[PDB]
Amino acid sequence: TGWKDIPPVPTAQEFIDIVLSRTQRRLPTQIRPGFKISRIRAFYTRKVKFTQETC
Amino acid sequence: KRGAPGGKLKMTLGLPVGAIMNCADNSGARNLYIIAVKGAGARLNRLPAGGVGDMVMATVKKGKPELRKKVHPAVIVRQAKPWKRFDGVFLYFEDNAGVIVNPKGEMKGSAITGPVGKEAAELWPRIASNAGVVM
Amino acid sequence: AGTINKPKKPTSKRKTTRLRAKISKRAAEKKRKERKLARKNPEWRSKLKKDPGIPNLFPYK
Amino acid sequence: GSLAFLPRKRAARHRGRVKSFPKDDPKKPVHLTAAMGYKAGMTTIVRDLDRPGAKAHKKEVVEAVTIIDCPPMVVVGLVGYIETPRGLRSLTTVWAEHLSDEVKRRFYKNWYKSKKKAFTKYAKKYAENNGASITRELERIKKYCTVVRVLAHTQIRKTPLKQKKAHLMEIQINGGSVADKVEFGRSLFEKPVTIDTIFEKDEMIDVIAVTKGHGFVGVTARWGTKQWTVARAGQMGYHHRTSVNHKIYRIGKGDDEANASTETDLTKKKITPMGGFVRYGEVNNDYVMIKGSVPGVKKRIMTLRKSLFTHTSRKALEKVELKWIDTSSEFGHGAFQTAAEKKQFMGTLKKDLQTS
Amino acid sequence: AKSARASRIKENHQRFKKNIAGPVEAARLERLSAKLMAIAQASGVKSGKSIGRKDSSIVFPM
RNA sequence: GGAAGUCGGAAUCCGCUAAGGACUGUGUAACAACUCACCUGCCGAAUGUACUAGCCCUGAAAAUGGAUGGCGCUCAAGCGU
RNA sequence: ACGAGAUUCCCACUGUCCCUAUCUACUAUCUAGCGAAACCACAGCCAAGGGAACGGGCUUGGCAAAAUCAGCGGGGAA
RNA sequence: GGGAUAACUGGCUUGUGGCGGCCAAGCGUAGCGACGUCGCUUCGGCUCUUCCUAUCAUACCGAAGCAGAAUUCGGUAAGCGUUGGAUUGUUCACCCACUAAUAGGGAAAGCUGGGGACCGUCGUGAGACAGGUUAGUCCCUACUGAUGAACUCGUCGCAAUGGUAAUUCAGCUUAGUACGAGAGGAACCGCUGAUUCAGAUAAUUGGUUUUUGCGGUUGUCCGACCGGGCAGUGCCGCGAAGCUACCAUCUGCUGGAUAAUGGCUGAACGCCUCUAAGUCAGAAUCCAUGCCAG
């Protein structure tokens, strides 16, 4: 049929902005030092994992 | 284009998800198992339900082995739950039956056993072409 | 932004006394660290400073 | 549930107030706005649909309609309002001479034991050369008021109701100069106004009434469950409601003797069902056949008013053609429209021969 | 979809109210007013033409 | 393939000069054409650049409705002396 | 082969559910008579502030109108 | 065995790594030194009300070889919604679809499944003990409804204030048109339905039956018949009335001002500029009307 359905390929800088904005706005961004250590570990683990899946 | 018919009028739906209805065509299937209803809404705890002329997604429980390999669209042709037509007539059939139909609306079989509901015949011309009795 | 029609929660300027002591302790602590760091002073100090001199716009230069 | 109807308390009054009359401009002709009727019941009709673009176009459709008994209202007064920075204010009202006993019953709680002298001194105002006082009030309305309303009361002696205390309301006079409508209101004194003059066929109206009561009901049936925002138990029903966009399908005359007849069926019959409207009686006056359902129990006072805005749908300004009107009994699985049709079907009975 | 308070829907309704619904309701009002017209037509101090006085507060009592 | 300052690599000189880059962008398949740099005429008196110091905006905020103490205050009822 | 043993599958049934509705009796409700106990510093509206993440009485705002009946569960170191 | 210690965090947190060199305005008179570039790489489920926006969808805008269709990135926006199953084979636990979409959090919370510490004795290259002791703290108010004294009783009204409501999709026409080599393939105006939500209503259809209304029938009894009693309404059939059901039917409405953004005239700044003075339009936004209470 054709190859018009290929999604656009972002530039190197636009790729980073797309990935980093998604992990900032699609996930909560408020953690406090007074929480449990397991809760803090789970919060930052989610951010690292979420960034990779989008990538 | 999702196979939700347009111009359909409101009627009493009497075939929820998880119901067994007979198969009215000569494609080799005997009964169908409803697992999804095309055009269903999004409300909590509500089981999607179908009616005469509504495309559903069904699997063949008993029938020809080929038809038991994949989930097929189907249009409900007869309904045991009484419903009302706009002429003020409350009517019902003695069984629940449908026909295997491709996503566009073309019947896979070539003949229909039993009468075809008026709403299903008017909505889908292909079912109207392969019908012997319309009531 | 639609701030006029639908303003958000105000940012309180009512100082809580917990912050004020906490804000004063940090000012005291920060001042002490400057004095201690200026004591270590691994940096050269001269006698004569760079005098900018008479300004050019002074009519009697 | 909905927080727009939140104070789910009993209505302060059994009658129901209009709360809004349509906006007035002097360019339109002089006309009335609202009227009163009594709910009779429901019946089934067959309509020859003429809806271009619908599936039932050029086809017959069966619909449910409600019947409201509408005896003519009597205009017995006039009220004038002025605009203030604090809203609308009643400046003065001018009553007519010779009020009826029913409208005087509204003014009394114990009418039987009372010495009926309401408006006795007011009547002397007309007939004892104090007509200057009456005219002075009429001229006061003309030169100071911006909205003029008419006090009209029902005639329940014509209604098959045990109640003898009539219902008063103010109906706004719209479409004209303040001077023009004042002469309009004075000319309407002591005169009956029929429903076919206020409304007409195939027009869409709003109905105001108090809903059926249910008493103390829990959360399951009150708020519809599967603080002020949390569902609680309390009063369900008897709530003031304003339902809009209800199409008048027919206005019967009562004296026609063929109210339920159409141009399709040639049966001389009235609107009253075989055996009478269940729990209401017989409609012997003008009636308004309103499509669908309407708030209120049978024999409840019903407030009909006009649409506040010009309509934006083809449901309005579309002709309504009727094929057949049901008249069979509502007291059971009726199958006969007339007493003659039952006797023809079953032949003659044992009692028929014994009496004859 | 477009809301009931959409600007475009209001503009379309305004044209409908002016070009289709208006004339029909104007003709209806003429007929109704004619019927009610038919039913209805079926010294200043001593006469009341000089509108005089019949029969909490706003100012401070002096 | 075509490449004329302007798809690319590298050099980037001289003449006429008042001045004009072996060219700053638009443009052509390549030209053409336009534009910038720079120069002249008209106009006429003050301008440009970069920093410094004040005050003001931004310089990141979640989740019951609320806080310079409150009303409120703008040549202040704010800021400096 | 046996087992009120467990699990899976197949047929059948079901207000378990889509999604609730109706009906009956005793209560709940009101009256006559009889008639306690638990518990009780004194009280009892909300918001922000009250350094010791502590408020119910203070601050300063929102406010704020007698006397009652029924429903409820929101509040009272290692 | 002894000593210091109840324990932590509170304008905390969020999107862009560290180390070394080069460059580097300054500070300074060698040392600190940003942005760039180079080098090396206890847990799960259940929930109702409200709030937030860090917006998945619906509305409106800016940009992209964006022809059309379908999209992608970004902006204003929380008005309105954000599903039904599997969890029965393997694992970083995640497939099946339906849908316009199946966004993330706070109030931090309760139910439900999964998954103790001191002495004593006998020994210690090491544990054993059914040896002893022990902690395990129906009223007021809030809300929802109903009455109410005082103002003579009543009738007809006003409207401060409080709440507020609608939502999404599809089909016909435009049109096999614009657009396109072909394959394919829109939109505004107009018309008709359906989903979710909300408020009502009983003509019709279905459900319900102490109408104990009529009939049939089992056991026992009134001596048989007739007519009946009892079986806490014996059982069965129909059953009006009432109540109810997106299991039935009806209805859901219009002005102004704005955000992003696109403009007009025009200084700042002898060009220019949507902005400075002035001003036009413009979102499901805001405020009101319609609606509910008084």
Query: Helices in chain B by DSSP H: which ranges?
Result: 118-123, 125-129
Handedness of CA D4, D6, D7, D13 (dihedral sign): positive
Query: Helices in B18-57 by DSSP H: which ranges?
Result: none
Asked whether the beta carbons of residue E36 and residue D197 sit closer than 8 angstroms, the reply is yes
8 A C-beta contact, residue D30 and residue D177: no
Please, is D253 exposed, middle or buried when counting C-beta atoms within 10 Å of its C-beta (0-12, 13-18, 19+)?
middle
Positions on chain G within 7 A of a protein C-beta:
11, 17-21, 48-53, 70-72
Q: With an 8 Å Cβ cutoff, is D148 touching chain E? A: no
Q: How far apart are CA D117 and CA E29, in angstroms?
A: 40
Half-sphere exposure of residue B46: CA atoms within 13 angstroms, side-chain side: 10
Does residue A24 approach strand F to less than 7 Å at its CB? yes
Please, is D209 exposed, middle or buried when counting C-beta atoms within 10 Å of its C-beta (0-12, 13-18, 19+)?
buried
Asked whether the beta carbons of residue E48 and residue D31 sit closer than 8 angstroms, the reply is no
Q: How far apart are CA D36 and CA D304, in angstroms?
A: 6
Q: Collapse the DSSP code of B74 into the 3-class scheme (helix H, G, I; strand E, B; otherwise coil) and give the result.
A: strand
8 A C-beta contact, residue B62 and residue B30: yes
Q: Beta strands of chain D (E only): which ranges?
A: 31-32, 34-48, 60-69, 73-84, 87-95, 147-153, 168-174, 191-193, 204-210, 215-217, 234-236, 240-252, 287-291, 301-305, 322-325
Q: Collapse the DSSP code of D40 into the 3-class scheme (helix H, G, I; strand E, B; otherwise coil) and give the result.
A: strand
> What's D212's DSSP letter?
P
Compute φ and ψ for B51, nearest 5 degrees: -145, -175
Beta-bridged to residue E43, according to DSSP, are none
Q: Which residue is listed with tokens 């008897």?
A: D238
Does residue E22 approach strand H to less than 7 Å at its CB? no
Q: Beta strands of chain B (E only): which ranges?
A: 15-16, 20-23, 29-37, 49-50, 55-63, 72-78, 83-84, 90-91, 97-100
| Chain B positions touching chain D (beta carbons under 8 Å) | 7, 9, 44-45, 86-88
Q: How far apart are CA D101 and CA D111, in angstroms?
A: 10
Does residue B89 approach strand H to less than 7 Å at its CB? no
Residues 6+ apart with CB under 8 A from B20: B31, B32, B33, B34, B61, B96
- Give, rounded to a whole angstrom, the gap between the first and last alpha carbons of chain D: 64
Which chain D residues have a beta carbon less than 8 Å from that of B86?
Answer: 55-56, 59, 61-62
Q: Using alpha carbons only, what angle is made at residue D341 by residues D335 and D345, rounded to the nearest 5 degrees?
A: 80
Half-sphere exposure of residue D239: CA atoms within 13 angstroms, side-chain side: 16
8 A C-beta contact, residue D243 and residue D295: yes
Residues 6+ apart with CB under 8 A from D131: D125, E48
Asked whether the beta carbons of residue D32 and residue E39 sit closer than 8 angstroms, the reply is no
8 A C-beta contact, residue D198 and residue E32: yes
- Residues E3-42 as b/e (b if ≥16 CB within 10 A, e otherwise) read eeeeeeeeeebeebeeebbeeebeebbeebbebbbebbee
Q: How far is D230 from chain B (nearest CA, A)?
A: 19
Which chain B residues have a beta carbon less than 8 Å from that of D328?
Answer: none
Residues 6+ apart with CB under 8 A from A47: A23, A27
Half-sphere exposure of residue D121: CA atoms within 13 angstroms, side-chain side: 1
- Give, rounded to a whole angstrom, the gap between the first and last alpha carbons of chain B: 29
